[PDB]
Design a protein around this ligand. Structure first.
Ligand SMILES: Nc1nc2c(ncn2[C@@H]2O[C@H](COP(=O)(O)OP(=O)(O)OP(=O)(O)OC[C@H]3O[C@@H](n4cnc5c(N)ncnc54)[C@H](O)[C@@H]3O)[C@@H](O)[C@H]2O)c(=O)[nH]1
Ligand SMILES: Nc1ncnc2c1ncn2[C@@H]1O[C@H](CSCC[C@H](N)C(=O)O)[C@@H](O)[C@H]1O
Length: 260
């Protein structure tokens, strides 16, 4: 059993008051007051982020931890926060975005965020059974939390396998993908094998809530996997009892318009 396995059990053992005090303490959170209601009322002329994912991918790129360029594929795009971010980047030429949609899952939000015309959204698509195709950059933000750590580990392993398939088709592709439960031994093993073939490493973004152990894998960085996960598990355990709240920051506004 890992330190992160312990963290998950301690999290599940929290009272509701302990859970509410823990989940957001010390984390960056974008101010979504205006974006949330523009999306609810169906406004489509807006460049404010459609989801909290946009700021996370922006942080990774600004840190230099991901390379977004060329033909981008967004696997499990949900509302599309990563697709709209990639579409606004000058080095990106097009985005093919796929997501399952349907009951309980998010469909793409349709807005005129800068470069929207370069995105081809396809909902109703299961990326785990879809044949890979050409891509310069492969992005995947898939991983639904579960109180059951074995389920989180299985969901994570499926994403790593998916990324191996896309790398087999595109050995030179830049990759960035969510690793929902890096604290599971079977995820660490699958990640180590990915690293030995393709390079890369793991990083925690400051927007992730303390109630999730999610980290992001990118071929553009390096680092011992076991050390990265353990450092993060210690940080998550250290925040139990912290009284500070979230740090509020402005939401990303990409502006509106086409790219040609
Ligand atoms: N001690 C608690 N831990 C919680 C709780 N809610 C979530 N969590 C943990 O955070 C993890 C991430 O939570 P997330 O950000 O995805 O929030 P959600 O509400 O969308 O997660 P769900 O699992 O779908 O929650 C649905 C209901 O499940 C309840 N729930 C979920 N886990 C718990 C636990 N462990 N104890 C008590 N109640 C729990 C929770 O109150 C909700 O009413 C989750 O997997 C759990 O390990 C919680 O209420 N109490
Ligand atoms: N097998 C699958 N095939 C396609 N989409 C899937 C999938 N499994 C989960 N998904 C979708 O993947 C999404 C991951 S969350 C998407 C967040 C996105 N990066 C943003 O910034 O908005 C969810 O909407 C889920 O419905």
């Amino acid at each position: 059993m890992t330190l992160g396995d312990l963290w998950k059990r301690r999290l599940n053992n929290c009272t509701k008051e302990e859970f509410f005090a823990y989940r957001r303490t010390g984390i960056l959170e974008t101010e979504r007051d205006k974006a949330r209601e523009l999306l609810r009322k169906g406004e489509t002329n807006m460049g404010l982020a459609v989801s909290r994912g946009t700021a996370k991918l922006a942080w990774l790129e600004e840190r230099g931890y991901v390379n977004l360029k060329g033909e981008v594929v967004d696997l499990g795009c949900g509302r599309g926060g990563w697709s709209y971010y990639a579409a606004s980047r000058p080095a990106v030429m097009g985005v093919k975005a796929y997501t399952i949609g349907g009951k309980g899952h998010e469909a793409p939000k349709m807005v005129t965020s800068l470069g929207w015309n370069l995105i081809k959204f396809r909902a109703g698509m299961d990326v785990f059974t879809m044949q890979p195709h050409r891509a310069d950059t492969v992005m995947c933000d898939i991983g639904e939390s579960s109180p059951d750590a074995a389920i989180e580990g299985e969901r994570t392993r499926k994403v790593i396998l998916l990324m191996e398939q896309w790398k087999n088709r595109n050995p030179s592709a830049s990759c960035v993908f969510k690793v929902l439960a890096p604290y599971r031994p079977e995820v660490i093993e699958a990640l180590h094998r990915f690293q030995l073939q393709w390079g890369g490493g793991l990083v925690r973004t400051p927007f992730s809530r303390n109630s999730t152990h999610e980290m992001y894998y990118s071929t553009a960085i390096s680092g011992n996997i076991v050390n990265s996960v353990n450092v993060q598990s210690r940080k998550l355990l250290a925040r139990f009892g912290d009284q500070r709240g979230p740090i509020r920051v402005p939401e990303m506004d990409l502006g509106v318009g086409t790219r040609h």
